[PDB]
Enzyme design. Structure first.
Site, short mmCIF file in Angstrom:
data_model
loop_
_atom_site.label_atom_id
_atom_site.label_comp_id
_atom_site.label_asym_id
_atom_site.label_seq_id
_atom_site.Cartn_x
_atom_site.Cartn_y
_atom_site.Cartn_z
N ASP A 142 0.82 -1.20 0.00
CA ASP A 142 0.00 0.00 0.00
C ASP A 142 0.87 1.27 0.00
OD1 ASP A 142 -2.21 1.70 0.14
OD2 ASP A 142 -2.65 1.24 2.26
N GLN B 274 -8.41 7.18 10.57
CA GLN B 274 -8.85 7.74 9.30
C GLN B 274 -8.40 9.19 9.16
OE1 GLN B 274 -10.72 5.15 10.76
NE2 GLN B 274 -9.83 3.93 9.20
N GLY B 275 -7.89 9.47 8.01
CA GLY B 275 -7.29 10.73 7.67
C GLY B 275 -5.80 10.76 7.91
#
EC number: 3.4.21.4
Length: 224
Positions: free
Chosen positions: A84, A177-178
């Protein structure tokens, strides 16, 4: 970042915020004047023009130097959560100096050792599913969790040789998240990973999972 504190100026000279559609989205690491490393999932298949990088600031929305993107390249073996990482090329070159600098990378073939300290930073949520996010960069320090323990948490196939894990058994300190794509460093401030995925955020006994720079140096070195 859950359980974090405010980063100081110059803590991460290479950190960039990656806005999308004018809003918070991801983090990244400035590798050289025209290149950012982030998570593939932050960018893969999305409209490139929606992204804006900012370097040299503790805020996502002012300070420092911005750039749009010229190109996006995901790892050639990116699949699901595996591998990733992506290389972004910048439309505007960003010079080092002041609070801007370029990342130094974990050695090829290195693998963070369980129990060693790591520090992760970003502009993401401060709780799982939080809607608000901080103006200024947060950071948190968590120990590396062995790949074996991480495979006990997530399953054997789920955690590959291109991932490593970090967190505390009790939870309460993690990326969220973020924060995806932003840096995790070792105790020397060498870049060891990018924020990638996990089960929720800061949950007990579910480590954060990071794309491993030491495992992914061939891609990084070839395209940076």
């Amino acid at each position: 970042i859950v359980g974090g504190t405010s980063a100081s100026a110059g803590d991460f000279p290479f950190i960039v915020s990656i806005s999308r559609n004018g809003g918070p989205w991801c983090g990244g690491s400035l590798l050289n004047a025209n290149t950012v490393l982030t998570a593939a999932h932050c960018v893969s298949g999305y409209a490139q023009s929606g992204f804006q990088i900012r370097a040299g600031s503790l805020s996502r929305t002012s300070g420092g130097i911005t750039s749009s993107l010229s190109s996006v390249r995901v790892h050639p073996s990116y699949s699901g959560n595996n591998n990733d990482l992506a290389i972004l090329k910048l439309s505007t070159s960003i010079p080092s100096g002041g609070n801007i600098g370029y990342a130094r990378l974990a050695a090829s073939g290195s693998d963070p050792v369980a129990g060693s300290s790591a520090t992760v930073a970003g502009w993401g949520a401060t709780s799982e599913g939080g809607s608000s996010t901080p103006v200024n960069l947060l950071k948190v320090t968590v120990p590396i969790v062995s790949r074996a323990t991480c495979r006990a948490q997530y399953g054997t196939s789920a955690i590959t040789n291109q991932m490593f894990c970090a967190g505390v058994s009790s939870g309460g300190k993690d990326s969220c998240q973020g924060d995806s794509g932003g840096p995790i460093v070792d105790s020397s401030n060498t870049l060891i990973g990018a924020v990638s995925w996990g089960n929720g955020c800061a949950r007990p006994n579910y480590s954060g999972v990071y794309a491993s720079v030491g495992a992914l140096r061939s891609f990084i070195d070839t395209y940076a």
